[PDB]
Each structure stands twice: as structure tokens, then as C-alpha cells.
Structure 1
């Protein structure tokens, strides 16, 4: 027999509550810019003073140098590797890559994960407050921190027990998303799901609560927009079924997490963000109002993004043209 027990799949431990220090906000503001990349953001995260509670032991540096050869993002070459920053930057990548770690590093990684959610939210808030569209790259990193995968990974890799053998069976029959899994016929699905009932229970918890949302909008008085006037927009989000709750299912993240979304209005050609609201989609249908400053006269192609903070590949977007008088 030997059932693999995963007690924190859907029943997370409670992460110790804290508020990010003003010192850390200052440091992040100094280091971030409108051109910051995913690599830059992961490095900045790693420099938080809050990680001073993460141990560094005799011999760790040499183990981390060995580990660095196996990871895709390079630590800044002009920067001391004798810091806890080096450890955090490398262990978070080992988490995304799902590499095997010795026990002491597994322990350290748990301690690191306890702190990451408030920190990545500060990154999103710094970038968005300044109107930088790269806030969306920070949101991608937020999703990676919850599911323990890379932004570029096969989205099916989030599903418990979906190993490389199962992924290739999915490729064989053009199954690409979690939604594709559920739209299949019984014989096709049964063939892919060559797992024990215990393993299937864990697949089920994930599929049950994976979000499927529909995005729509209405612009108050679209045919009469005036430059510099505060303008309201209504954004509506609908689910096919009202969710039982918003507890996140994550195999790799061991703490309790509640599902949240960012609603974003922006302009891609200008790399500009115009409005942002953090919301919880607890009902079968819901609508929200965002306020923004009407852009300059002329044509503008805008986009609304709905981006989840807890899963990959469930995001939605809509683009529309406005003509400011």
C-alpha cells in the first residue's frame, strides 16, 4: 500500500502574521523600476531584512554554489554570496524547479515561504502605485510562489501527481489546460488518470476549486469622454457555479491561503497602469467600479486584466478602444 499523505494540500498551517517593515519598503522602492524583470524581482525579494531569521550554517555556501549550477537565474555577479540573500534567491528557484533538497534546506525553505506572501504583495503595490505595467510580472511571481512552478511551466504541472509520463499522455491527445481535462470523455480521462484512488482524491481537490471565470465590462458614458475628468468603469465577473469556499489547493505551499484577484486597467503601448483593485470572487456573479483619470485626447486601446494570486493559467483579459474628446 503506502498512501502518500499530504496533510497540507488543502488544510494549510497558519503563517505567523507580520507587517512588512518600512525599512524593507524603502529598500524595495530603491531597487525596483519600470524596467525590472522577473529575475530582478526575485533578487529584490531575497534582500528583505525579514529574511534575517533564516539560518546560515557552516558548509551552506559551498552547497549553494553547487546548487546554483543547476538553476536558470544568476545571482548578481558583483554581490557577496556570503549573505542570506544568496540562500533565499537559490532555494526559491529550487522550489520553482522542484529539485530535491537535503533536510536542513527543506526546513529553511519552509521558513522562507512563511514570509513570501506579504513581500510579493508589497512588490505589486510599489509597481502599481507608480502606474508601471510590470506590476503584472510581479503577479506572475505571486502565482509561482503559491504553486511551486515556473511561469513558463506546463500549467498541468500544478495538478498533484502529474508526472512527466502523464504530461506526455496529455500531449498525445491535445489536452493542454485544466479545463480540457474536465471536458474530456470518460475513457480518455481514465487513460490519463492512471493513479490510485488516494492519488485521485488529491487530483480532485485541485480540479474542484480551480477557478473558471468570465470577464465583461461597461463604460459609463463611452460616447462622451473628456480628458482629465475622473471616469468610472464597471467590471463584472461571473462563475459557472458559486464556489463552496476560497481555500486554495496547493501541493507545494504548506500554509493556508485564500484566493484573491487583481483587477487591472491599463494601456499596453504605453506600458501604463491606470487603475487597480484587489477583490475576492466569493459569489456566482459580482461587479466592481474602478475610477481612473481620462487619458489625453485621441484614440487609446485599453485592456482589463483579471489576474489570480493563487493559481496559474486561470487569468482573463479583454481589450477595447476608447476615443477621448
Structure 2
């Protein structure tokens, strides 16, 4: 009986099917189709991948509502193909398909399903990202390498036969080339406005800066990067960061259905943070903002929104990384906030709310019994023994196992540094500082454990150095701590003359409340 709405329809010979079910239920449904029990099955558009072998395929409504453009966009032909799609299993030498349609979309579907699909390029849209990536690799170091790259692509071998689709009126070996060149130039000259690449005369050199490189690394689009750049500045808040994260081109494939905006609005009463004043409500950004908070606070989402959340989570880990590391590049100490946010995302809990909720499968009923033994941090759970653990948690075995795993791979780490020369401190010199980190246990594998983040993650860290009053970061480095104890060398530029009360952090990218710190003073000349 989970969900209960599947019961009453399915009881009279008409099954239900949508995305993000309890797997067991789905399996049962499938069985009931295969076995010959359920005659009819109602299926959503997202579950065309779940190929249940039917005979007569009905396709009801070729017009899907999406809240990106706030209108009924038609069924793309690929989806239709996928749906039919399913050859006749029971009835041999036969095939039946009913497609319920508009008059406007009749000639569109009547031709491109019976006759082949003319395949064309959409590279002209995403060239900015791709080009940037190429530049970062450094196979492109000029405005002819790009051309060469293009020539080894579908765009260039599709534009010959069908030039009018992409906007080329000449249709010749020269004209086409010229057009391509122009396009390349255009692509470049949006990159140069932002902090992506640099071009100078001596054939002529092209190379990346800090912003391009990060983008290249994480597979994020140009537009998104630009957006991030424009909003993110010094002394920005967590809310602001969240907003920035939400505003991106990666969330164009997160469907806002009919009667979703209202739902979102309703939800907004039971969230910690609020949305900024000078943006839109119907757009996907708002939804993203809402749904990110919907699992920091462990709320009771509908099964439509679960899918959306999952989709968001698919995208965010790169985006959040970018956010944290763009601020680092810029050189501001609100990177800590970003790091914290990232941790939350990885796990699914706030920084101030509760450290004990972090552990897989914890709730407010059992947290009263955890506060009984004066447990504040998660490192106190490592020192506990089995008898007390049993008393605490009275749940199923898998959950317990998961918890144990979490406890184990979550390392107790120590922060110890070793400076080259505390006496000889010169201003504006690349002063190296060897930091010698440590773990409690050496890892078998670096696998991060979290219930509300389904996709798997490998654990990483972030070494930091920055002044608290100024909010100006000096030294940063990401590390993959696979050994038990290592040393790492931050080659950083020393600050201006006089005293500077510097503070190191050892913030993890995954686990909250592992912010080991050690403040110290230096006098620079």
C-alpha cells in the first residue's frame, strides 16, 4: 500500500506507472504486466526507458506543460519513437499504435515517424563551453586550431548540405570558412569579457586564466560561469551563494509541471531561508532554491518533487565545487561558507541545526537519547562501544551497517604545520609552508556514505589560510588523502608588513563538523 493511490486504480484493471517509485512496487507492477494479469497500464513520459512489452500503444496528449517557457511544448519525436518503441509481444505479425494529436502537429509526426529523422547539429549553442574546454587542454593555442577542431566535427560536415539551417547564405568553400571564423571570434569575444582566456600578438597565442580552467575541469557551461562571476563578490552570504547556485543553465532539464508553482509557494512557509526579491517565481531557479532546502531540513516531499530533487543533486556537486573554488580564485574568506554549504549538500543537514542528524538514518525521537549522554560532536560516537550503540539505535540491520560504515571512514584528523622560517618573513614573497595532516584510520576506499544523497562520492579535503577581520584568503589546496599521514606545501604570497593573526582550517568537502583549526601569529617585514 505504498503509495496508497496505486491501489484503487490498479484494483479494477488499470495500472499506474511514474518515475521515482519504491522499486519493489515498480517490480510488482512489471510482473503484473508480464504475467498477463493487468490489461492496461498508464505510463508517464519520463518512464519510456522502462520498456514494458505491450501490444497496442496508446499515446494520449502530445503536448507537455513545462514552466521554463510557461506553455505546452509538444512531444519531441525521439520520445514518441522510444514509446513505439515496443513491438507486439503476444499477437504475432502485428503492430498497433494510437497517437492522440493536434492538427498543427499532425504533419510533424505523420512524416518523421514513418520517414527517417533528419539529424542536425546543436553545437552552435554550446560552442562557448566546448571551446573553453579545448583551450584549457591547450590543443588550441590560436584561431586556426579552433577551425581545425570544428572541421573534425558534425557541425562542419552537416553545414555543407544544409547551410540555411545554421545561417549561411554563401554556400561555398570560402564563405562557409569565413562564417566559421566569425563564429569562432564571437565565441572568443564573450570569453574575454569574463576572466576565461587571454589573447596577445607575437601565430598568435591563446591561454586560460583561473576561471576558464575550473569550468573546464567541472564540465559547467559558459553562461552559468558568467552568472556566477557577476553575482559572487567579497563578503557574500550563504543564502546568496545558494541563490547563485540555483541560477544556472544546468537546470533546463528539470520539468515544472502544471500546478507546481502553487505547490512551491505553499511549501515556502516551512523553509529556513527566503528567495531574493529581484528574480522570477515561475522559473526553474526558484524551484531549485526551494528543493535544495527541502532536504537540508528533512521534509515530507511528494513523489513528483523527489525526482526533481534527484535531478538537482545530479548537477550540483560540480556547481558547488565551482562556487567554492571561484571564491578561492577571487581570494575572499567567504570560501568557508561555500565549503560548509558543499558539506551540507553532500550530506543533507544544516551547520548550526544539529551535527548528530548527519549520521545515516537519524531522527528527532532518537536524538533525545543521544543528548542524554552529552554527545555534542560526531567524534564522541567513535569512542562509544557496542552496548551503548544498541541501546541508542533499535532499527533494522542494513541501516546499522551503514551507520557503522559512516563512523569508520569518517576519520579523526589532526592539524599540524611546519613553517620554513618564522624569523625571516619578507613581504610579497612566495613563502612555502609544509602542513603535515593525519588520519585516525587509513582508508580501504574513500567512499562517502549518505542516505539523502543517493549518488556515490569519493571523499576530499580543503586546506585553507586566511585572515578573519579582513576576509582575504592567502593559501588554498584540495587534496585526496589516501594515505594515513602526508605533507602538503602551500606556496602562498605573504601579506603586507607588521603583525598578521593567520588561521588555518582543515574543512572536508563531504562531512560536517570536521573543521579542525589552528590560529597563529607572524610578523612580516
TM-score, length basis structure 2: 0.58
**2:340 alignment partner in structure 1:** 140
Ranked by relative contact order (alpha carbons within 8 Å, sequence separation 6 or more), the top structure is: 1
Could you tell which deviates more after superposition, 14-23 or 209-218? 14-23
C-alpha distance in 2 between matches for 1:192 and 1:57: 43
TM-score, length basis structure 1: 0.92
Q: 1:13 to 1:87 in 2, by over 3 A?
A: farther
Q: CA deviation at 1:282?
A: 0.7
Query: What is the aligned-residue RMSD (CA, Å)?
Result: 9.8
Contact kept, 8 Å, 1:8 with 1:254, in 2: the verdict is no
Per-residue CA deviation, residues 285-316 of structure 1 (Å, 9 max, x unaligned), is 10000011121111111011111001111121
Q: 1:101 to 1:26 in 2, by over 3 A?
A: same
Which ranges of structure 1 fall in alignment gaps of 5 or more residues?
A: none
Contact kept, 8 Å, 1:88 with 1:112, in 2: the verdict is yes
C-alpha distance in 2 between matches for 1:97 and 1:77: 23
**1:203 alignment partner in structure 2:** 403
Q: 1:33 to 1:3 in 2, by over 3 A?
A: closer
Q: 1:10 to 1:274 in 2, by over 3 A?
A: closer
Q: 1:228 to 1:260 in 2, by over 3 A?
A: same
C-alpha distance in 2 between matches for 1:83 and 1:241: 46
Q: CA deviation at 1:9?
A: 38
Q: CA deviation at 1:18?
A: 6.3
Q: Secondary structure at the match of 2:432?
A: strand
Q: CA deviation at 1:158?
A: 1.4
C-alpha distance in 1 between matches for 2:214 and 2:307: 16
Q: 1:220 to 1:12 in 2, by over 3 A?
A: closer
Contact kept, 8 Å, 1:15 with 1:256, in 2: the verdict is no
Per-residue CA deviation, residues 96-128 of structure 1 (Å, 9 max, x unaligned), is 111111111101110110000110111112111
Contact kept, 8 Å, 1:234 with 1:288, in 2: the verdict is yes
Aligned length: 325
Which ranges of structure 2 fall in alignment gaps of 5 or more residues?
A: 1-200
Q: CA deviation at 1:322?
A: 0.5
Q: CA deviation at 1:245?
A: 1.2
Q: 1:192 to 1:170 in 2, by over 3 A?
A: same
Contact kept, 8 Å, 2:402 with 2:449, in 1: the verdict is no
Contact kept, 8 Å, 1:149 with 1:157, in 2: the verdict is yes
Contact kept, 8 Å, 1:9 with 1:250, in 2: the verdict is no
C-alpha distance in 1 between matches for 2:279 and 2:439: 47
